[PDB]
Design a protein around this ligand. Sequence first.
Ligand SMILES: Clc1ccc2c(c1)N(CCC1CCNCC1)c1ccccc1O2
Length: 273
Amino acid sequence: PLESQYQVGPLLGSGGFGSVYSGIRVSDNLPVAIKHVEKDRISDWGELPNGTRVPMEVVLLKKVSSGFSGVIRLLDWFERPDSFVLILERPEPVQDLFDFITERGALQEELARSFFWQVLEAVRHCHNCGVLHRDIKDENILIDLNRGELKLIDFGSGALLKDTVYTDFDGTRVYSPPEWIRYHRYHGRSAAVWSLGILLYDMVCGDIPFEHDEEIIRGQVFFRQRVSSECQHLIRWCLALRPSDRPTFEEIQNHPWMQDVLLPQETAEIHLH
Ligand SMILES: Clc1ccc2c(c1)N(CCC1CCNCC1)c1ccccc1O2
């Protein structure tokens, strides 16, 4: 019934997340994304309300797909003999933030502010649903170009959020915090804040601040592009070497650089249309 219920279009991409295709739900004409993962490539398993064996990714997605948010929602899923297939929302027209930044270079602060704020609201939403993403980065953010709305993707490296230490990680090394690099240990929220500092630098500079392990550990931030003092300060705070010196989400969102955020639609009219 996956074959009759969905019409398959082109391959959008493939990678550690599997293979994702453009698609249409035949019932209405809802644009969707169809994501295939081989069972043998799934190390992380969990269990449902009734309790079948599913990828952890499905558990995490169900927990965050209830109601609206800045997260791409799981609409349905299917099990095949050797794979799982996930049906996800697909905005149209859409561009990922990595491609967007590659094309336009460094973002104006007004645009970075609106984008970053929406990322924060989306991550707070995950954390409130009990989910830690663990791979927040430009390539895992989609822009709905008409509404100016940002949407999180790829919970395949994620976990249930907890207050105790994580000693495993399968996200992106150059967004991973120094405590992971040095000790193979981190706590959820403070690691997420570090990766948010990396993302914000990426937005306002057009590239990531650290390539090598030693630079991450050193934690000295050099600005290659002109960036306001208030924005440099927020970035340097998120990228504090000691986890406990980093801001909470509330402190990030009350920071002076974060005031007077544009609405998504305004953001699209000014910067995206
Ligand atoms: Cl339109 C669309 C909707 C929903 C999507 C996805 C796309 N993707 C693909 C992301 C692009 C990034 C640029 N390079 C190619 C893959 C996705 C990738 C991994 C997990 C879930 C995903 O859920």
